[PDB]
RNA sequence: ACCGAUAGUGAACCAGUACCGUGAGGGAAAGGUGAAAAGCACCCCGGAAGGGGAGUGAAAUAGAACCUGAAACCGUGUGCUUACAAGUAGUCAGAGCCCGUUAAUGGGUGAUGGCGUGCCUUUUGUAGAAUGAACCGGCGAGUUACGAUUUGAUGCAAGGUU
RNA sequence: UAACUUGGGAGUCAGAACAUGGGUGAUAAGGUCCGUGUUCGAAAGGGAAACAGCCCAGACCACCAGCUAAGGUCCCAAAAU
RNA sequence: GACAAUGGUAGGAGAGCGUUCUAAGGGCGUUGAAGCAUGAUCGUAAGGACAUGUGGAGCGCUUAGAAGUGAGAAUGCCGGUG
């Protein structure tokens, strides 16, 4: 059928997690954790840990096979962000945005 | 007693904002801009009620004279033709018929040089 | 006869209320005209 | 108003070089949390008029009820015994004479029912009842009166 | 076989078996009305055109009457404090043209 | 109500073929921008092209009147600083007179996207010999 | 200098076109039996045999 | 015929408190699960957080960042359309393609053609290269007391009125 | 078919160009000051390419009807090669 | 019926809509109120209904009365977000 994973409150940038996101959309599971396994970016490995959890919960609680899950979804929304703030010079000072992310993976068997 | 505004700014605001649908970016967004847009599109269409009416005498006026000169005539020495030889049909009508019937339009094109 | 009451005709207005929206006639300036002594809070020269 | 709200007393910036707008204090309409421009005041609703309006307005209310029982013998207060008496005969004004104190008492607990005394006779008493229960001596004394 | 009507300050070219819209027409809901300004008549059959050719006419039936969509008539003035609203449905009568 | 619009399938296209030999250059690019646009015909709407195909030929044959050889200065900018272009019609008439013709004619076609549709209609050879004779012109005199 | 008017959310998506980042070119190990990175060292098991 | 969390006290909350100042002194933001904690036992991924089931519950997209949950804003998917074109972004006409309503001359999109230099303010006169507005939401400006004056209504009338 | 009177209520006291009679200037100025008129101000529509004041003409609203006004009829661009 | 009028800034006059509350009357509502979302609805405008989702407990309607009665502009104030 379909099994998502959700992880809330990532603390990372959200368009510096769709950067990944626009790879393994689509894709199989298989190749998706390679690809999230090989990449440089920052953002694989809590996405590792999210698809994983997503292909578990699949074949825990809906049992189907962990050998056709392609992922039909993945997408980042955002989430409370922290703000901070900067001394610049003179006085002033700037405000600072620690954003964060929701990372949402929905993996399917399409059939 | 106090009356705070509340759901009545709401409510026509977004009787605005349905209004303004098909808007190109922030235009069917934004309310500040999309009222603007809306009252130049009620002007706009004012206008162009009347401007419609123009558009349509230019046309058929051309339509007319692109068949009298397939019978040897002009639009003004045929236009004389009829209104002289007897009232008759308007510009509408008569582009028209020049377009479905071949056939009758030669009709009028002979009774109108018959007004010399 | 207390759900049904009636004012004699004539006898009530309801009182003119300025500076709310330009439909009224007097929303913009609110009836004062532009700039001067007189379009200022604060009322005009005194009378006489 | 401003002269009210705490604080305030201080211009918060400079007016010049801020680059902000000029404002004044913190307590001003504009801002959030000082100053209400006009509005509530303590202040009296009531007015007169004339002697004689007032009286003729008495009269049409009685006029229109117009377009009566003996006396109330209650002696104690006993709200059946007034239920009863209210239904041999439900927006009612039971008018007695100065003050019968057993038939106030036996009537103020029915919810509809209003009494009072021929030298209380209101004009929305009068017009908010659907019904006039006045005795033989409450008549002759607004008879007398008005 | 078609004609020319004069109905409302406008001429109309009418085949049978139309559905027409014209201005309001004083008839009710489902009647009969005879057009006498017909300026030109025939199609494959004649063509006789005169001011009015005034010995055809035309039968159709008065199938609805009713109001065009609400057009709004807004306008307003620049930099001078000046507007207007208005509303407008142009009543109509819809007509199915029976004979010739 | 009742006005007849032209559509993809309503519409024909003709070729035409006129010669270019001791025309005026502008008594004919009128006539011949006319023919483009297209209302020679009944089914005239603005926003088509119901327009036909023409094929102007003999174009090293036009003629002009009085002193316009050697006047009428074509001018050209080549939006470099200071860089503009000149060309006489006469020297124009001998080096490219299939470029004469078409700029007469399509300065007389509106200059909007359908304009443009119509302006690339026109063919013209300086010669008497076009090879679009898989198209079946057709003669045409000048009305 | 300051930007004289606010980028509308198009113009932005445009210029954003190209903020992709491509896949890195791997391929599988014949031995590990997963997927390495060309040219480098299998990551799960050992060898690297070229 | 007082307010209802930007209101009402500066303070509905451990508030003259965080914080600011050498100091006198200035000064905020901060409410709501549920009828009842019944506040998620157990299993799986994970280092945890966080989830997916399973249960409590009337409801868990009421899971303590807890009543509803708007807009700006950020995304994912998809029906119509766009890489030779000069655009205050609409309006009138209009093919083509896709749907199907408060069922009535239907809705969405829009090849293409005609017309068309935002809004306030201030000015003799602004598309103006004069002002002002980043956008969204909320708050934000002829009021009350007492006198005078004229108008409408009402009541009496050489009297009227407290 | 307006006019005056007596009442309540105002706004205005920066005017502009065009024709015309003058002053000033230099028979300069989209200059400046006055008499008379028109339009803009507060006026949209058509023509003057574009263009408050120039010529025509005063928008209650709908119409895919007709007649004219300044101005025009080779093409852009409606109507006379 | 017939005729006539209906550009408008400062400004003058009239008729109205809508919000919160109050009195009276009469009603709706856990068989689902207010609110929010969508809609191809009715009115000459301000605006008024209706239907479906969401929501969970209060609201209309007539007639009067009283106002902290309507926001796009203040280098407006506070929050959020580009």
Same mark, same amino acid.
């Given at each position: ?111 | ?35 603007? =847009? ?12 009347? =401007? ?65 | ?6 004012? !004699? ?13 330009? !439909? ?14 007189? !379009? ?9 | ?49 004339? *002697? ?17 029982? %003996? ?6 207060? *006993? ?50 009842? %659907? ?9 002759? *004394? ?5 | ?100 | ?143 | ?50």
């Amino acid at each position: 059928m379909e099994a998502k994973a959700v992880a809330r409150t990532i603390r990372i940038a959200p368009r510096k997690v769709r950067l990944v996101l626009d790879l393994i959309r689509g894709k199989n599971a298989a190749e998706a954790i390679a690809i999230l396994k090989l990449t440089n970016k920052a953002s694989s490995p809590v996405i590792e840990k999210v698809l994983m959890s997503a292909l578990a919960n699949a074949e825990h609680n809906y049992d189907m096979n962990t050998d056709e899950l392609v992922v039909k979804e993945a997408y980042a929304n955002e989430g409370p962000t922290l703000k901070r703030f900067r001394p610049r010079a003179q006085g002033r000072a700037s405000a600072i945005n620690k954003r964060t992310s929701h990372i949402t993976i929905v993996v399917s068997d399409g059939k | 007693p106090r009356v705070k505004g509340g759901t009545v700014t709401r409510a026509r605001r977004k009787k605005t904002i349905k209004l303004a649908k098909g808007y190109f970016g922030s235009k069917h967004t934004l309310y500040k801009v999309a009222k603007q =847009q809306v009252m130049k599109s009620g002007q706009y269409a004012f206008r162009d009620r009347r =401007q419609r009416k123009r558009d349509f005498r230019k046309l058929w006026i051309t339509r007319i004279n692109a068949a009298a000169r397939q019978h040897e005539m002009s639009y003004s020495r045929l236009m004389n033709g009829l209104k002289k030889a007897g009232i008759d049909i308007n510009r509408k009508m008569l582009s028209e018929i020049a377009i479905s019937d071949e056939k009758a339009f030669a009709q009028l094109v002979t009774k109108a040089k018959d007004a010399l | 006869k207390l759900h049904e009451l009636k004012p !004699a005709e004539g006898s009530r207005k309801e009182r003119n209320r300025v500076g709310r929206g330009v !439909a009224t006639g007097n929303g913009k300036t609110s009836g004062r005209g532009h700039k001067g002594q007189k !379009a200022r809070s604060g009322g005009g020269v005194r009378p006489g | 108003n401003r002269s009210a709200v705490s604080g305030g007393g201080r211009k918060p910036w400079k007016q010049k070089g801020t680059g902000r707008a000029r404002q004044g204090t913190i307590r001003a309409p504009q801002w959030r949390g000082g100053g209400i421009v006009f509005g509530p005041t303590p202040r009296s609703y009531a007015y007169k008029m004339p *002697k004689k309006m007032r009286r003729l307005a008495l009269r049409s209310a009685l006029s229109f009820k117009v377009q009566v029982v %003996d006396a109330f013998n209650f002696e104690a207060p *006993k709200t059946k015994e007034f239920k009863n008496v209210l239904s041999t005969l439900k927006k009612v004004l039971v008018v007695t004479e100065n003050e019968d104190v057993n038939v106030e008492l036996s009537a103020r607990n029915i919810p509809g029912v209003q009494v009072t005394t021929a030298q209380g006779l209101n004009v929305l008493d009068i017009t908010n009842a %659907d019904s006039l229960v006045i005795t033989e001596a409450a008549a002759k *004394k607004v008879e007398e009166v008005l | 076989m078609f004609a020319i009507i004069e109905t409302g300050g406008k001429q109309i070219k009418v085949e049978e078996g139309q559905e027409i819209f014209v201005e309001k027409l004083d008839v009710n809901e489902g009647d009969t009305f005879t057009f006498d300004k017909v300026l030109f008549v025939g199609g494959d059959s004649v063509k006789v055109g005169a001011p009015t050719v005034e010995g055809a006419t035309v039968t159709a039936t008065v199938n609805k009457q009713g109001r065009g969509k609400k057009i709004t008539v807004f306008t307003y003035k620049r930099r001078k404090n000046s507007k207007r609203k208005k509303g407008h449905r142009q009543p109509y009568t819809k007509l199915t043209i029976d004979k010739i | 109500r009742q006005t007849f619009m032209a559509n993809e399938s309503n519409i024909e296209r003709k070729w035409y073929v006129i010669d270019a030999e001791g025309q005026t250059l502008g008594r004919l690019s009128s006539e011949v921008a006319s023919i483009l646009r297209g209302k020679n015909k009944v089914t005239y709407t603005p926003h088509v092209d119901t327009g036909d195909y023409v094929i102007v030929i003999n174009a090293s044959k036009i003629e002009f009147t009085g002193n316009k050889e050697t006047d009428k200065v074509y001018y050209r900018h080549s939006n470099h600083p200071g860089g503009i272009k000149s060309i006489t019609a006469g020297e124009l008439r001998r080096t490219n007179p299939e470029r004469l013709i078409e700029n007469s004619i399509k300065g007389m076609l509106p200059s909007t996207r359908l304009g443009e549709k119509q302006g690339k209609k026109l063919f013209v050879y300086g010669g008497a010999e076009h090879p679009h004779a898989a198209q079946q012109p057709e003669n045409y005199e000048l009305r | 200098a300051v930007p004289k008017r606010r980028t509308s959310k198009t113009r932005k998506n445009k210029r954003r076109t190209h903020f992709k980042i491509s896949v890195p070119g791997m391929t599988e190990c014949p031995n590990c039996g997963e997927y390495k990175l060309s040219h480098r060292v299998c990551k799960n098991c050992g060898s690297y045999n070229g």
